[PDB]
């Protein structure tokens, strides 16, 4: 069974052909994240966007493991030239790349992508994105941080989805209503997993309300550390 | 009757539960704005995007009044860490937050969002946005600065609109044909108010051309200072 | 016959009412581009976004020719205030402007828009855009660098397209499958020209796979220097 686990906020982990992939590795500064910077093994890191709660420990993790960081062209240049990360792969929206683990395709999201420096100036890191993985015959749609958009149904029709990770926190993303609508109306995956809630007071939600509002496929409310059952 | 008035370019003012809310306060540097920084009373400032003709007097207005500034996460960081604004609430697209005035939900726009510093370098302030307010049983859709997009119909279906503020200036936003198509095809509000024209030579339009081309609901051509008649 | 030519990556050149317009002038540093910055004559330069492979020689080209640079508000601010470019016209998505050559209208794209200064800090230059030209009775849709989006069909239905320039390079934009779907399903132009391939190893594509996959209108595989046959 394909290995795919949730680890708090928008952090997911998966294996394809014995290669380890993490998304949005907010580990050391998320007390609800079950992962440890010291012990996690990865060959690749994929970033949906540059916000602190996704960017997280990418620099320290990339350096320690020698993992390749996949993201926007701006993100790749930033990690490379500002942070000195040796192994980066720049991409953009609609772009697909084949790696030894499987494929990464970046899709559109509605949000922002920046990392705020000490002077208070946000450093722009491209348009925010979602990820479509094809790994061991499974199609995984991580929506990233996003508002509701009708082209979610274009992404899902062109890439029928096994597992969708969808933010339900509200304030900074879709809340319960928009995220359930996204699943019911546009994505219709076999498995839905809600993400990006409870990490901060502002995004505390009852994921049961999400599960009650979803009428299509299976909803799996994964706590940090738990894996998707296929 | 709910208090809702236009003050030139994209500046709207409203009252909910006796709290005063201003959007995109371009006051001191807009000669056609009937408002004055010294006398304007506000509890909340909402910014659709960072451009000078929307950002306007937010810093000086926020310190004089102690008003809370609601905007993108980047806007909140920038205003707080760079300009030292005391009271900010960071949000992002698809996010909804409940205040004592009513609710504010950010939605997508197609435009840009930055404030250009002395040296010609823009500061990135997120993706540009529109606003859905629910205030005193009214749904208000300020589209912000945007081009035409079909998800205007999704925003409107999910949040049936009482008043829509829609830019008609062209060059920088929708002109007459697109704005009127947005109203007739996608949004279909009870009341349409054209905004973002005549302030500069480049965005001079006859709003009567807009009202002529709209076939749905009621078009109220408001001069700065004039309120919406419900 | 109206003059319209492809010069590698996303560089196009056209003439209307004896005025010369270039798009994304990446000349000096593209070895597959047949143009020479010393001999290139233009009255107008149009920028879809700020990536180096589009920005290209805009500053040197603009000063030598006195050409007006048309782009995003941010691009206009940046070229003017930072680079001292004399003649700029700021626009934004959905905005249309009439020139002696014909009309330019900016439309949305899904990509990023920056130019990187030292140490991997991007200068933000707005949302990335496509262009709708109306020149000597022809409608040209340059999609810019973009992923697939359904509003390609709104743009094409509101502005029926004679020539579409569409990226097929993949990784950083649509690849073969997405680009051919865009043409077949959404744009349906008289003529399709694939762009943004072969220039770098990462974006190497056989444009015959695109032509075989397109079922609507005529596909013209232009080598750098070749012109559209109407
Ligand atoms: Cl759409
Ligand atoms: Ni975020
Ligand atoms: Ni987030
Ligand atoms: Ni603006
Ligand atoms: Ni504006
Ligand atoms: Ni690009
Ligand atoms: Ni490019």
């Amino acid at each position: 069974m394909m290995k795919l686990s949730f680890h708090g906020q928008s952090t997911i982990y998966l294996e394809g052909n014995n290669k380890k992939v993490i998304v949005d590795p907010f580990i050391s500064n998320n007390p609800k994240c079950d992962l440890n910077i010291e012990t996690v093994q990865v060959d690749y890191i994929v970033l949906t966007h540059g916000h602190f709660d996704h960017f997280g420990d990418v620099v320290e993790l990339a350096k320690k493991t020698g993992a390749t960081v996949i993201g926007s062209a701006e993100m790749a240049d930033y990690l490379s030239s500002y942070h000195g990360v040796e192994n980066v792969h720049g991409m953009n929206i609609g772009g697909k790349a084949n790696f030894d683990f499987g494929s990464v395709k970046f899709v559109q999201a509605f949000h922002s992508s920046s990392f705020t420096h000490e002077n208070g100036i946000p450093v722009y890191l491209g348009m925010p994105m979602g990820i479509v993985f094809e790994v061991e015959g499974k199609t995984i749609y991580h929506t990233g941080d996003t508002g509701l958009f009708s082209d979610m149904s274009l992404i899902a029709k062109r890439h029928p989805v096994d597992v969708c990770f969808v933010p339900i926190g509200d304030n900074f993303t879709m809340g319960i209503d928009d995220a359930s609508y996204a699943i019911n109306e546009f994505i219709k995956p076999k498995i839905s997993v809600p993400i990006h809630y409870d990490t901060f007071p502002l995004i505390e939600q009852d994921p049961q309300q999400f599960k009650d509002a979803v009428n299509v496929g299976d909803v799996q409310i994964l706590k940090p550390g738990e894996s998707v059952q296929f």
Side-chain angles (χ1 to χ4, degrees), chain A:
Chain A
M1 188 182 73
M2 188 237 165
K3 155 53 65 195
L4 172 60
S5 53
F6 174 63
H7 299 285
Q9 193 68 159
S10 305
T11 312
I12 71 171
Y13 173 95
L14 67 83
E15 304 197 7
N17 308 331
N18 303 298
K19 298 296 180 179
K20 302 179 171 74
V21 177
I22 198 172
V23 172
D24 295 1
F26 185 51
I27 303 173
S28 58
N29 283 326
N30 184 190
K32 289 148 194 297
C33 176
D34 65 312
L35 297 183
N36 197 310
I37 290 313
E38 302 298 336
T39 61
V40 64
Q41 287 132 218
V42 284
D43 301 288
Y44 303 89
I45 309 174
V46 186
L47 306 176
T48 59
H49 74 292
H51 287 160
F52 76 93
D53 56 316
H54 300 262
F55 195 86
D57 302 283
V58 58
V59 176
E60 176 160 28
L61 224 209
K63 205 102 172 63
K64 183 138 197 268
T65 65
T68 295
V69 189
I70 301 162
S72 77
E74 282 85 355
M75 175 65 76
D77 291 336
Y78 178 70
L79 286 179
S80 182
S81 292
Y82 189 68
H83 281 291
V85 172
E86 323 291 41
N87 301 115
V88 297
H89 181 65
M91 294 178 74
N92 223 316
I93 298 172
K96 190 173 145 153
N98 300 305
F99 294 85
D100 40 31
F101 69 79
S103 70
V104 187
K105 179 181 177 74
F106 287 108
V107 295
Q108 29 175 313
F110 292 94
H111 198 66
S112 45
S113 187
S114 72
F115 192 90
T116 298
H117 282 221
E118 263 286 76
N119 57 354
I121 301 297
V123 163
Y124 167 80
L125 294 170
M127 287 182 68
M129 312 182 283
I131 313 156
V132 179
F133 289 113
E134 289 144 48
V135 169
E136 300 193 340
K138 297 305 182 170
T139 295
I140 307 141
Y141 177 24
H142 188 316
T143 68
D145 287 11
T146 196
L148 182 62
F149 66 104
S150 69
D151 278 355
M152 284 169 158
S153 70
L154 182 62
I155 292 151
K157 283 339 185 97
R158 305 266 303 148
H159 313 272
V161 177
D162 287 286
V163 191
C164 180
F165 298 94
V166 66
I168 72 158
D170 219 328
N171 191 261
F172 304 97
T173 65
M174 301 194 278
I176 299 297
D177 293 343
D178 292 346
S180 56
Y181 188 82
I183 298 300
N184 284 163
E185 193 67 18
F186 295 152
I187 301 174
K188 305 199 214 81
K190 307 227 191 77
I191 302 161
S192 291
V193 178
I195 63 159
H196 203 279
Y197 66 95
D198 283 350
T199 320
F200 313 106
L202 223 23
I203 66 178
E204 282 172 354
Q205 304 294 159
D206 183 3
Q208 191 56 228
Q209 278 165 27
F210 171 74
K211 175 160 179 144
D212 292 352
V214 168
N215 311 308
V216 52
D218 182 39
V219 180
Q220 288 181 30
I221 309 176
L222 303 178
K223 302 184 167 79
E226 299 192 325
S227 303
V228 170
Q229 306 296 301
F230 277 100

Short mmCIF file of all heavy atoms in Angstrom, two decimals, chain A residues 59-86:
data_model
loop_
_atom_site.label_atom_id
_atom_site.label_comp_id
_atom_site.label_asym_id
_atom_site.label_seq_id
_atom_site.Cartn_x
_atom_site.Cartn_y
_atom_site.Cartn_z
N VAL A 59 15.31 24.85 4.77
CA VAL A 59 16.76 25.18 4.61
C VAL A 59 17.58 24.15 5.40
O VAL A 59 18.42 23.45 4.79
CB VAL A 59 17.08 26.62 5.03
CG1 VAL A 59 18.57 26.91 4.96
CG2 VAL A 59 16.28 27.63 4.19
N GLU A 60 17.31 24.03 6.70
CA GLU A 60 18.04 23.10 7.61
C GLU A 60 17.85 21.65 7.13
O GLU A 60 18.85 20.91 7.07
CB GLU A 60 17.58 23.35 9.05
CG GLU A 60 18.19 22.41 10.08
CD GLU A 60 18.14 22.92 11.51
OE1 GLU A 60 17.22 23.71 11.83
OE2 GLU A 60 19.03 22.54 12.31
N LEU A 61 16.63 21.27 6.76
CA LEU A 61 16.31 19.89 6.29
C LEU A 61 17.08 19.60 5.00
O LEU A 61 17.74 18.55 4.92
CB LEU A 61 14.80 19.75 6.07
CG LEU A 61 14.13 18.48 6.59
CD1 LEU A 61 12.91 18.15 5.74
CD2 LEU A 61 15.09 17.29 6.63
N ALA A 62 17.00 20.51 4.01
CA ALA A 62 17.67 20.37 2.70
C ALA A 62 19.18 20.16 2.89
O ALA A 62 19.73 19.24 2.25
CB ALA A 62 17.41 21.57 1.83
N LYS A 63 19.80 20.98 3.74
CA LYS A 63 21.26 20.98 4.03
C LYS A 63 21.67 19.63 4.64
O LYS A 63 22.63 19.03 4.13
CB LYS A 63 21.60 22.11 5.01
CG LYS A 63 23.04 22.60 4.96
CD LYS A 63 23.20 23.90 4.20
CE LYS A 63 24.59 24.49 4.31
NZ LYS A 63 25.63 23.61 3.70
N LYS A 64 20.98 19.19 5.69
CA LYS A 64 21.28 17.95 6.45
C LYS A 64 21.14 16.71 5.55
O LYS A 64 22.08 15.90 5.56
CB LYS A 64 20.37 17.84 7.68
CG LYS A 64 20.64 16.64 8.58
CD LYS A 64 20.59 16.96 10.07
CE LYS A 64 21.25 15.91 10.94
NZ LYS A 64 20.28 14.88 11.39
N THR A 65 20.04 16.58 4.80
CA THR A 65 19.73 15.36 4.00
C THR A 65 20.34 15.45 2.59
O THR A 65 20.55 14.39 1.99
CB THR A 65 18.21 15.10 3.90
OG1 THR A 65 17.57 16.16 3.18
CG2 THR A 65 17.55 14.95 5.26
N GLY A 66 20.58 16.66 2.06
CA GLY A 66 20.94 16.83 0.64
C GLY A 66 19.74 16.62 -0.27
O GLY A 66 19.94 16.41 -1.48
N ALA A 67 18.52 16.71 0.27
CA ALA A 67 17.26 16.61 -0.50
C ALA A 67 17.22 17.69 -1.59
O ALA A 67 17.81 18.79 -1.38
CB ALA A 67 16.07 16.74 0.41
N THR A 68 16.57 17.40 -2.72
CA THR A 68 16.25 18.38 -3.78
C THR A 68 14.95 19.12 -3.40
O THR A 68 13.97 18.44 -3.08
CB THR A 68 16.16 17.71 -5.15
OG1 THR A 68 17.47 17.22 -5.45
CG2 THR A 68 15.70 18.64 -6.25
N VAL A 69 14.97 20.45 -3.39
CA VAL A 69 13.75 21.27 -3.08
C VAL A 69 13.10 21.62 -4.41
O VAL A 69 13.77 22.21 -5.28
CB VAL A 69 14.03 22.54 -2.26
CG1 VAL A 69 12.72 23.18 -1.81
CG2 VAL A 69 14.94 22.26 -1.07
N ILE A 70 11.84 21.22 -4.57
CA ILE A 70 11.04 21.52 -5.80
C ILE A 70 10.10 22.68 -5.46
O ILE A 70 9.42 22.62 -4.42
CB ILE A 70 10.32 20.23 -6.26
CG1 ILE A 70 11.34 19.12 -6.56
CG2 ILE A 70 9.42 20.53 -7.45
CD1 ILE A 70 10.76 17.73 -6.60
N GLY A 71 10.08 23.72 -6.28
CA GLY A 71 9.12 24.84 -6.10
C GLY A 71 9.11 25.77 -7.29
O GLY A 71 9.71 25.43 -8.33
N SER A 72 8.48 26.94 -7.13
CA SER A 72 8.50 28.04 -8.11
C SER A 72 9.95 28.39 -8.45
O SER A 72 10.84 28.15 -7.61
CB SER A 72 7.73 29.23 -7.61
OG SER A 72 8.47 29.95 -6.64
N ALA A 73 10.18 28.95 -9.64
CA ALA A 73 11.48 29.49 -10.11
C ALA A 73 12.03 30.50 -9.09
O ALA A 73 13.22 30.41 -8.74
CB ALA A 73 11.33 30.11 -11.48
N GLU A 74 11.19 31.41 -8.60
CA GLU A 74 11.59 32.40 -7.57
C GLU A 74 12.05 31.67 -6.31
O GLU A 74 13.06 32.09 -5.70
CB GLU A 74 10.42 33.34 -7.23
CG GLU A 74 10.19 34.41 -8.27
CD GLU A 74 9.32 34.01 -9.44
OE1 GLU A 74 8.95 32.82 -9.53
OE2 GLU A 74 9.01 34.88 -10.25
N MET A 75 11.32 30.64 -5.89
CA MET A 75 11.61 29.89 -4.65
C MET A 75 12.97 29.22 -4.82
O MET A 75 13.82 29.40 -3.92
CB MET A 75 10.52 28.86 -4.35
CG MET A 75 10.84 27.99 -3.16
SD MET A 75 10.89 28.94 -1.62
CE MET A 75 9.14 29.17 -1.35
N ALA A 76 13.20 28.57 -5.96
CA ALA A 76 14.46 27.87 -6.31
C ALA A 76 15.65 28.84 -6.25
O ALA A 76 16.69 28.46 -5.67
CB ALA A 76 14.36 27.24 -7.67
N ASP A 77 15.51 30.04 -6.84
CA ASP A 77 16.56 31.09 -6.87
C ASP A 77 16.85 31.58 -5.45
O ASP A 77 18.03 31.84 -5.14
CB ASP A 77 16.13 32.32 -7.68
CG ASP A 77 16.02 32.05 -9.16
OD1 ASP A 77 16.69 31.11 -9.64
OD2 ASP A 77 15.28 32.81 -9.84
N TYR A 78 15.80 31.74 -4.65
CA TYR A 78 15.86 32.25 -3.26
C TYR A 78 16.63 31.24 -2.40
O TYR A 78 17.59 31.66 -1.71
CB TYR A 78 14.44 32.51 -2.76
CG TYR A 78 14.32 32.99 -1.34
CD1 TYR A 78 14.75 34.26 -0.99
CD2 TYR A 78 13.74 32.19 -0.37
CE1 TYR A 78 14.61 34.73 0.31
CE2 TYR A 78 13.59 32.65 0.93
CZ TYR A 78 14.05 33.91 1.27
OH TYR A 78 13.91 34.37 2.54
N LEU A 79 16.23 29.97 -2.45
CA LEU A 79 16.87 28.88 -1.67
C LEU A 79 18.34 28.78 -2.07
O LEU A 79 19.21 28.71 -1.17
CB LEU A 79 16.14 27.55 -1.92
CG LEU A 79 14.77 27.41 -1.25
CD1 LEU A 79 14.14 26.06 -1.60
CD2 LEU A 79 14.87 27.58 0.25
N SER A 80 18.60 28.81 -3.38
CA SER A 80 19.95 28.71 -4.00
C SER A 80 20.82 29.91 -3.60
O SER A 80 21.83 29.71 -2.91
CB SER A 80 19.81 28.59 -5.49
OG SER A 80 21.08 28.45 -6.10
N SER A 81 20.42 31.11 -4.00
CA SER A 81 21.28 32.33 -3.98
C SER A 81 21.24 33.02 -2.61
O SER A 81 22.26 33.58 -2.23
CB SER A 81 20.90 33.27 -5.08
OG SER A 81 21.22 32.69 -6.33
N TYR A 82 20.11 32.99 -1.91
CA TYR A 82 20.00 33.65 -0.58
C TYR A 82 20.42 32.66 0.50
O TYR A 82 21.20 33.04 1.37
CB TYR A 82 18.60 34.21 -0.32
CG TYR A 82 18.54 35.07 0.91
CD1 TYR A 82 19.18 36.30 0.95
CD2 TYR A 82 17.90 34.64 2.06
CE1 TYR A 82 19.16 37.09 2.09
CE2 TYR A 82 17.85 35.42 3.20
CZ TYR A 82 18.49 36.65 3.21
OH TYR A 82 18.45 37.42 4.33
N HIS A 83 19.94 31.42 0.43
CA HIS A 83 20.13 30.41 1.51
C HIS A 83 21.27 29.43 1.22
O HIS A 83 21.64 28.73 2.17
CB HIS A 83 18.82 29.68 1.79
CG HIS A 83 17.88 30.48 2.64
ND1 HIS A 83 18.15 30.75 3.97
CD2 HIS A 83 16.69 31.04 2.36
CE1 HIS A 83 17.15 31.44 4.48
NE2 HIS A 83 16.23 31.61 3.52
N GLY A 84 21.81 29.35 0.00
CA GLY A 84 22.91 28.41 -0.34
C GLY A 84 22.49 26.94 -0.31
O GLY A 84 23.35 26.07 -0.05
N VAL A 85 21.22 26.61 -0.57
CA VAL A 85 20.77 25.20 -0.72
C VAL A 85 21.30 24.69 -2.07
O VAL A 85 21.07 25.38 -3.08
CB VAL A 85 19.24 25.07 -0.60
CG1 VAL A 85 18.75 23.67 -0.94
CG2 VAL A 85 18.77 25.49 0.78
N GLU A 86 22.00 23.55 -2.08
CA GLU A 86 22.79 23.07 -3.25
C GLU A 86 21.86 22.50 -4.32
O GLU A 86 22.15 22.66 -5.52
CB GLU A 86 23.79 21.98 -2.87
CG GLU A 86 24.45 22.14 -1.51
CD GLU A 86 25.42 23.30 -1.38
OE1 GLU A 86 25.11 24.39 -1.91
OE2 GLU A 86 26.48 23.12 -0.75
#
